[PDB]
Assembly symmetry: D3
Homo-oligomer: 139 residues x 6
């Protein structure tokens, strides 16, 4: 379906390093349609809710602290097969596994600093979109 | 210093996939993004944006075009960000613009000039207040 | 052999979306030599002849119609191993399978809109070159 | 409007792998490619191109250099495409050219200035007629 | 002709990951790299570089900043490389610089202007002698 | 370890073709730290020492001659996992095997002209660094 949607975020390292435009540009070049957009610094509560499945893991406090350390950019992209293509564009979540040509492949080294997040599935996309955006924020 | 300017990617700029390019140029310049949203302007919003030209010809055509599709609204912060913004966009009329600028690289026609930037600090403050709530600025 | 040649075309979507220069540039950057070049809008007959092996398939009329819908750019490139490298540069024919870094990986989403065509073999290259170009059009 | 200009990538521009870059800048500008071919100019073609300078010194050297290897001939269409073409290429003499332009980015020497663009609509029409048949324009 | 100029990426230019970009622009321009090294300037080196301004205010702040981290020193060779270098970098004061130039694209503040280029052949020869031994030039 | 280091060189073809800045830029963009840098034309002795493990191979004289034919750029990069990421960035040593997105994938065709060299392991990196640089040349 052409109306498939995904959630993409530029993380605080990606924003600090001036990678917002580059990421957005790669999605535009790919041919996908931006339908929602905002910049904000996550609260602790937001960072914890985002990483809620991993809340029992020992590296969780560092993830939450880092994620809430500065502004992120939230996006929603629309188009056919946009979820899978989004993940492919960002590259393997561990930059050590990422291919050049991808966002993480080109720009990231450390997994706790992997620049940007993309939904891993349609269910996850729906959850993340609903988490970060009210329905009325989506154009 | 903590100076802020307003930049919008107009419907033509969004349609041609130029949003990321424009953001990237400001980032590369060393400026800090403090506000961002995408929307299709209402008639009222479009009229407000062009309020100064309401007694000029084809005000309705300009208003109609600007409300015809989504724009991207941004606020950027940094020393001389207003002036630098104007320099980066290039002359408002693309025909007078130099390559290396946004309009210089991507636009031909003043009617389709991709983007808009505040022409002054005063104008910046007006536009920023128009498009964003106080609570929308990080 | 250094004199190996391939046929590359920018399809109507690729031309409309202003991707001609980008594709050409990637071939120049790779180090290959452009020896033939033209722009034209295929006739129905040309589009059908191009897709002649698939003429019994139900999506054939759409392929022919689309391919003849606007100008394409025809090219011939020369150099060692140019056929395989050409296909690798364009990426998987189905953009869903294409890797970032490639033309289709970077720019295309839908298979009926895959931006650009490259010969899949030396035999095919010879056929396509001969189809689109007279010998005297090749510099 | 339906204005057309002629652009050629000279042998130096082709050799340095700059054809795609130059095409890309016109595409990004929003212009429409209506004619395209690659060839090594004959002596006669090179003399015709430089016909106005035939009584100037080293006419044979210029002619010899231009026929020394392939050029890419193009015709581009759009409002102000001639003027915009000149602006995009930058000053004919690279020493006077600004970065952001083709000559500004890639050339140093007027003798090796990568590309040529028509200096006028009249000149465009002459060059277009010189390099292309009516039936070669889409 | 066999003219040479000196270019340095200052600590801010190195920190922001701009070394490759700057080298690439000279390469694309058609110039030849003849010398290259990375180092953190000593106090003495920084004082020597800014020797002409030693009786001007905040000489110590400029010296301290320049010795605060690594710079990249380069020597480039080619016809008009000095002038072309100045043109490529853009106005020393980023506020007066045009997009398409290094400072035009990446800098806002004269105090953080990414890079330095010799302002003259005389200055080039002085700087080249200052930063490189004869035996370091290829 | 964050202090891992690798040796990267732009070969004479890469320097002649103006690829120095591009390569350096990809390493900067990836987030690695340049700690040593110089340009020089290898002597015959240097080229032979560099290729010393292959000195009995018949294509050795051509490798040595080519490598000593013009200036190369020597570099040392520092950062976590920098060796593996360096090789991944350069791409397969045989350009026929290299992926678009990589240096060799984007720019090289022939294996005797593969533009640039990167250490294949930490041991090799230490050897190459020590070969090309005195300790006091590393910042």
């Amino acid at each position: 379906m052409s109306s498939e949607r995904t959630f993409i975020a530029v993380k605080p390292d990606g924003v600090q390093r001036g990678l917002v435009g580059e990421i957005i540009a790669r999605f535009e070049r790919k041919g996908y349609k931006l339908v929602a957009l905002k910049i904000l610094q996550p609260t602790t509560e937001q960072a914890q809710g985002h990483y809620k499945d991993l809340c029992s893991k020992p590296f969780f406090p560092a993830l939450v602290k880092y994620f809430s350390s500065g502004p992120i950019v939230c996006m929603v992209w629309e188009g056919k097969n946009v979820v899978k293509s989004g993940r492919v564009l960002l590259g393997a979540t561990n930059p050590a596994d990422s291919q050049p040509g991808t966002i993480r492949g080109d720009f990231a080294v450390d997994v706790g600093r992997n620049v940007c997040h993309g939904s891993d599935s349609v269910e996850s996309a729906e959850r993340e979109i609903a988490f970060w955006f009210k329905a009325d924020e989506i154009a």
